[PDB]
Amino acid sequence: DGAEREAALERPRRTKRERDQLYYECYSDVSVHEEMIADRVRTDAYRLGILRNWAALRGKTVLDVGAGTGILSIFCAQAGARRVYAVEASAIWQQAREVVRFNGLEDRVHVLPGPVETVELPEQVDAIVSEWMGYGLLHESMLSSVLHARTKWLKEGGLLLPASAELFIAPISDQMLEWRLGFWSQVKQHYGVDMSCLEGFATRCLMGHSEIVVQGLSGEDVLARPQRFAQLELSRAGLEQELQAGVGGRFRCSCYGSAPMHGFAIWFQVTFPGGESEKPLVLSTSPFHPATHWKQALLYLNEPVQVEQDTDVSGEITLLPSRDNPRRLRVLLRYKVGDQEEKTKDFAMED
Amino acid sequence: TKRERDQLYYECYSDVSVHEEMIADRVRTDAYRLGILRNWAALRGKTVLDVGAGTGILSIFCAQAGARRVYAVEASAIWQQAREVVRFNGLEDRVHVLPGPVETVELPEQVDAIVSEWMGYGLLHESMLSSVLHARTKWLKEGGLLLPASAELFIAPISDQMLEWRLGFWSQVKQHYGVDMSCLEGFATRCLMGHSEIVVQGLSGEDVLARPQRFAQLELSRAGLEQELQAGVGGRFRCSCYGSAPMHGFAIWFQVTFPGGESEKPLVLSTSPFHPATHWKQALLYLNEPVQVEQDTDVSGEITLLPSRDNPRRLRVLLRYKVGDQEEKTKDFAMED
Ligand SMILES: CNCCN(C)Cc1c[nH]nc1-c1ccc(O[C@H]2C[C@H](OCCC3CCOCC3)C2)cc1
Ligand SMILES: CNCCN(C)Cc1c[nH]nc1-c1ccc(O[C@H]2C[C@H](OCCC3CCOCC3)C2)cc1
Ligand SMILES: Nc1ncnc2c1ncn2[C@@H]1O[C@H](CSCC[C@H](N)C(=O)O)[C@@H](O)[C@H]1O
Ligand SMILES: Nc1ncnc2c1ncn2[C@@H]1O[C@H](CSCC[C@H](N)C(=O)O)[C@@H](O)[C@H]1O
């Protein structure tokens, strides 16, 4: 009976074990870590966000959830933490242990292999640090691992770095996309063959799909005031279950001027608590702000729509785990542009 | 599984991006345009087969050069777009688009000329050349024209400066973030060099460590070339280094040559690092780790390009090489996904 109930869960439990393992394997190679650490905005935001809380970290214990090469854990030790548990489920944990030793910090930072969900710490911790954010914030679905660790291991009143997240959406015009669509009408001048009749085909291929595209934009690509559509306070009880139901909200905005609208961009920021005198540090992935390796996540309409000053853009957006793969971000979008009817598009993160 | 591998191949060419990339490649596309134009005397009033016509652009170049009839054969769903482009340019009487593999297409007649852009990364990735030769044997009239007419492969030892910057990245972490990660160079090396994938990457002339060596010549008019592709294309090479450098491996690349026509001006389309960039870039064969070379360090070996056993359209490279008085070494590569 007890045994029968356990046997019934065995297949789903195993399948998840196996999907988790393939997810962690994405972090076994050097390139993703090179990219993360070359991202100075990301990495310095963590460095400074940690340093700013030095008075609260001095002599205290820290859990680094998903420590990777160990860099954030070493920041915490440099801020005066007495002990840091650097938990890492990917094989990169070996490189983290080497980095820790190479910096003479093997007494301060202990690298523990395996998922944070099952790791055994000697004690509860005074603080948790984690870089858990995926494309569109929630791709990878790592946030639930951080919350799991918090619930199990963070002391009452303990510190979370960062502490909260916000999501934003705006209508956009993608200049690179615009050039790719217009390419076919330029072939005649380059080569003497008129291929302008392929613009429709190009549009279907490049906009008619349902993949979320990771692409970096600039401020001038934004066609209306960005709208916050979600706020995640990481200490909030039951946030774990909300993630499974969907994160999102409704939006409305009004366009700045004339432009070919290609869709929407979403992006996020996270906030580190300020420390004693110090001010709250915001790590932003906005097109208005210095570029990061997250870029923005683009949600293309089926085809362009021309907008004008004060064209109204509204809708609803929800971020979900995808059906076949929980670690793949899915976006359900409802939107209405100007006097067009309301439309629906269901996206999944590109491979 | 054979039905299914072709389908995934032609799906690639069903989508716009590959054709945009090919046509935005000005060196590629103008080389064909000029190469075709140059042979107007062989083409005027004649019939042409375009093997793998794609969006139809080369077939239209042929009609513009005065061909009376062009059979644009295309196995992917892009054949629909080619037929639309042909109609849109008023050439439906001159260019006929025929769907399906050239191996089984039925033409109404033999042709005076074949044009084809059949070249993959490292020349032979995709394994399209056998389709062109199949068409030539079956459909090209005796003495007919082939555009391009020949191909050549080249190899040179290289020091990839961009790779070197990636390997050296870890030693620069301390300066900006105050954490010493120079101990990860070994790891970075194993990840970036220790794999057995062929990497498509553009190099500078400055990255070439010795005189490039031709290691194969493909004369497309030769009966028997079909079977050689099956045995492997390649042979030995030897060269001597220009100066001091951390050698990372070898680059291979190719050129193709269009006959000169009346004007007797052969046009070479090159993918060399010494020439303007093309979408083929070069194909890189990295050693497991760097080896230091000096002026006059001798580099020799043998290379063979083959289809992969499990996927005939995937390029495989068997390399044997000897640097200086190092022991001879071996590495097998397959084209990256
Ligand atoms: C939490 N900090 C993330 C910060 N950066 C996004 C990391 C990064 C830099 N470059 N590239 C990546 C990256 C890393 C992982 C990644 O996502 C993986 C989720 C997908 O597998 C899940 C597959 C498993 C196994 C098969 O079954 C389904 C689940 C790809 C995407 C980009
Ligand atoms: C004959 N003239 C080719 C000229 N260019 C190389 C075309 C091109 C421009 N951009 N990108 C390509 C490209 C096209 C095809 C390609 O490789 C082909 C083999 C690939 O899947 C076959 C089977 C798939 C992938 C491997 O695993 C199994 C499924 C498509 C690579 C680059
Ligand atoms: N449940 C889990 N337990 C342990 N590690 C995890 C995990 N989920 C994800 N990870 C790891 O968390 C890391 C996220 S990327 C961040 C790496 C590092 N903290 C840095 O800032 O550079 C990856 O190495 C990934 O393998
Ligand atoms: N056996 C075969 N028969 C017909 N078409 C083929 C083929 N093998 C490949 N192809 C097609 O050959 C084309 C090669 S790419 C070159 C496309 C076009 N001629 C241009 O120069 O822009 C692709 O569109 C591909 O689908």
Ligand SMILES: [Mg+2]
């Ligand atoms: Mg550098």
